[PDB]
């Protein structure tokens, strides 16, 4: 693909997301989703390799179905009130349809099946974009209509996403499927606190985005998409594996790392609303994510796996293209807990 065409497709994806983010009319939000998907499909197929075609087809079918249910919910809401403004969604059937459409777009359980397949079928740069930028528009819509959201349905899907992401990650040797299941669990954490406090949802999204960017850039730096391929990196660039281990520990949510701040901030919020069982189950379930992060850390950094002879040749060459925002992303994803009160700047 031509670099100018790639640039304009990326700008169209971002423009669709921003159109969703600045619109007050439901039709413009729908148009933003459509425009985002239209430019998103060719980015997933940048390298042809039929697995990418499969991932693009699955993604298109899922997102088109979600768009249709979203439009139907918009029309039902209009029928029961001649309103186009995005507000508290005067009709409850329309609200259920809208919540299901947005849950399909985000990949919350049980609409979660597509995320591991599409992520495994695309490249690491496409996976980075899919797991970071694509969540902004649906979550920005959910923040706006959160007051009319039914807690029982949203929280059921949140608990299901946390459980399913934790269970699915345990069985994975491929790094992109591990990232997908981690994404499902973090989406569940984001949407569990949404009916209570949207500032906590935004804070969790930002911390998850910086952690995911750091992890994906570290996986791009060491061109590894499998556990065994990543296990060779200690013998070529030890610093990369050390930073990967610290980022994995942070993603696990262990204090005093940055990953801990969102969970700590969500549990507290849920306790102010007399929700005790829900945060306890969520916190205990996140230990599955921690386990399959610790297993990767064992494979890549805390022990040394056997290497190959040709690796010697790689000792003579340097990483040519540098990612300028990787150091900032690593520091932001690890050493940011002491500045937790700054979250008040998000409301």
């Amino acid at each position: 693909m031509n670099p100018i065409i790639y640039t304009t497709l990326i700008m169209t994806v971002m423009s669709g997301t921003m159109l969703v983010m600045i619109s007050s009319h439901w039709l413009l939000i729908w148009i933003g989703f459509e425009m985002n998907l239209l430019a998103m499909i060719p980015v997933l197929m940048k390298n042809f390799n039929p697995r990418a075609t499969e991932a693009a087809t699955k993604y298109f079918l899922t997102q088109a179905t979600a768009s249709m249910m979203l439009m139907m919910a918009i029309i039902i809401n209009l029928l029961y009130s001649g309103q186009w403004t995005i507000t508290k969604m005067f009709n409850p059937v329309a609200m259920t349809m809208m919540t299901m459409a947005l849950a399909m777009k985000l990949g919350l359980s049980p609409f979660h099946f597509w995320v591991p397949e599409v992520t495994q079928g695309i490249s690491l740069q496409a996976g980075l974009l899919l797991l970071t930028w694509q969540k902004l528009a649906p979550l920005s819509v959910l923040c706006q209509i959160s007051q009319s959201i039914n807690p029982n349905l949203m929280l059921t899907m949140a608990m299901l996403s946390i459980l399913i992401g934790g269970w699915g990650g345990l069985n994975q040797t491929q790094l992109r499927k591990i990232m997908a299941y981690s994404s499902i669990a973090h989406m569940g954490w984001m949407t569990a606190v949404l009916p209570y406090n949207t500032t906590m949802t935004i804070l969790n999204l930002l911390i998850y985005i910086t952690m995911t960017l750091a992890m994906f850039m570290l996986l791009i730096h060491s061109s590894a998409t499998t556990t065994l391929s990543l296990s060779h990196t200690w013998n070529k660039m030890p610093v990369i594996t050390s930073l990967m281990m610290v980022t994995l520990l942070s993603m696990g949510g262990l204090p005093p790392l940055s990953g801990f701040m969102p969970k700590w901030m969500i549990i507290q919020e849920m306790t102010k609303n007399e929700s005790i069982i829900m945060p306890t189950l969520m916190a205990m379930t996140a230990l599955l994510n921690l386990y399959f992060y610790m297993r990767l850390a064992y494979s890549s950094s805390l022990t040394m796996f056997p290497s190959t002879n040709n690796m010697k040749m790689k000792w003579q060459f340097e990483h040519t293209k540098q990612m300028k925002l990787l150091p900032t992303m690593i520091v932001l994803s690890t050493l940011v807990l002491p500045m937790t009160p700054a979250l008040s700047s998000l409301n």
Binding site: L27, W30, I31, E34, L37, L38, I41, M45, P50, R51, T53, E54, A55, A56, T57, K58, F60, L61, A64, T65, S67, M68, M69, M71, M72, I75, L78, L79, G82, W84, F113, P116, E117, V118, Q120, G121, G168
Partner: protein
Amino acid sequence: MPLVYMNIIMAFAIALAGLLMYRSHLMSSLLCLEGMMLSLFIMSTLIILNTHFTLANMMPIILLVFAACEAALGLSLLVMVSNTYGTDYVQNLNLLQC
């Protein structure tokens, strides 16, 4: 709600159901996507005409435009899949697992 509104909503539900329950051909599912778009067009046009919302009269046309972009997208993908397998069967899209 009159009987026509429920008939249009039932048409949308039948199409959504048709989309969800896959048979073999990919094109059969693209047709159900098109049907869902047609049902939405008719529903919104009926609501808009009934309440005499003049400005809203342009939104179904817009709704039609992005219907084509979604169809043209889908057909495009259907070409590539076929070029890989000589068949548009959804059974062949099993290289990636969960």
